[PDB]
C-alpha cells in the first residue's frame with residue numbers, strides 16, 4: 487500500500503498520479519523573512535484546495551509532494567488540503583542538496599559524530615511512525631545531489647535512505663541538479679541494495695542527450711521528466727526538447743520506466759515571488775494542469791498510444807508508490 491497524509495491507500499486506488507509536485511514550498515531561509523512574508527493559512531488553504539479540485543477534474547487522484555524537511559514541509563497542511571478535496575497526497579522525508587541552504591546543521595552533526603544513523607532514524611521514524619508527533623507518515627524518501635558530484639555530505643542521506651528502503655520497501659524519489667548525476671545516483675542506490683523498482687531518479691528532463699537517460703536506465707531504475715512546463719529557466723530545456731527525448735525513449739520500449747510531473751509550487755512560503763518581465767514565457771506552463779491539458783494530448787498526436795500514456799501516468803506510479 488501507499489502511505490498518504492490521510493492514511494494507507496491501495497495501489498489500484500492511486501489512479502493517475504503526478505510523482506513530483508509541491509503544495510507548499512519555501513527555499514531555505516524563508517522562515518527568516520517571516521515579518522514581511524508571513525504564512526496566510528486561510529489564503530494558502532483556499533488556493534491549494536482550488537488547485538487540488540482542478541486536478542481531480544482532470545482525473546488526477548494522487549499527488550506525491552516532494553518537499554524536503556528543510557524546504558517548508560508541512561504534513562498537517564497537506565492533510566487539510568487532502569481532507570477538504572479528496573485528493574490523495576503523499577509527503578516526503580529527506581533534506582535538499584548541499585548548495586541549497588539549510589545544510590550546516592547536519593554537516594555539523596557529521597563532523598561531531600555519526601550523522602548517517604541520526605538521518606536514518608529520522609527517515610525510519612517519519613516513514614513508520616510519523617512526522618513531528620502528528621501521526622502523519624511520509625510515503626516517499628526524497629534525496630538530492632549537487633551538479634558536479636554526489637558530495638560526501640549528500641552520500642550520508644543516500645546510505646541512510648537505502649537502509650530504510652530495504653527494511654520498509656518505501657519509495658525513493660530524487661532531485662538531480664542541472665541535468666547531471668543521474669547514472670551516479672542510480673548506481674549508488676542499487677549498489678547499496680535499494681529496490682530499483684521503487685526508485686525514481688528526478689529532474690531527468692534537465693538533460694537533452696538521450697544517451698545520459700539510457701545510462702541511468704541501465705540500473706533498472708525509473709526516471710522522471712518532472713519539471714515539465716518550466717522552460718528555459720536557469721538551464722532547464724523547452725517542453726519541445728523534453729518531448730523529443732521522451733518520444734525517442736518511448737520508441738525504445740522504456741514506457742514502463744518513464745514518469746511525468748511539473749515540480750510546480752502551488753503556494754510559496756515567505757514573500758510571493760517577483761517574476762521579471764523576461765521570465766514570463768519560462769513559467770507560463772509551469773502549473774500542475776499543464777500535463778493533463780497540453781502534454782498528454784500532444785503525445786497522443788505524436789503517435790504515443792493510450793496504453794503508453796496510461797503506463798507512464800497510472801501503471802508506473804501504482805508499481806513505484808503503491
Ligand SMILES: [Co+2]
Pocket residue numbers: 660661662689
Ligand atoms: Co528538485
Ligand SMILES: [Co+2]
Pocket residue numbers: 506507508552553749
Ligand atoms: Co521539487
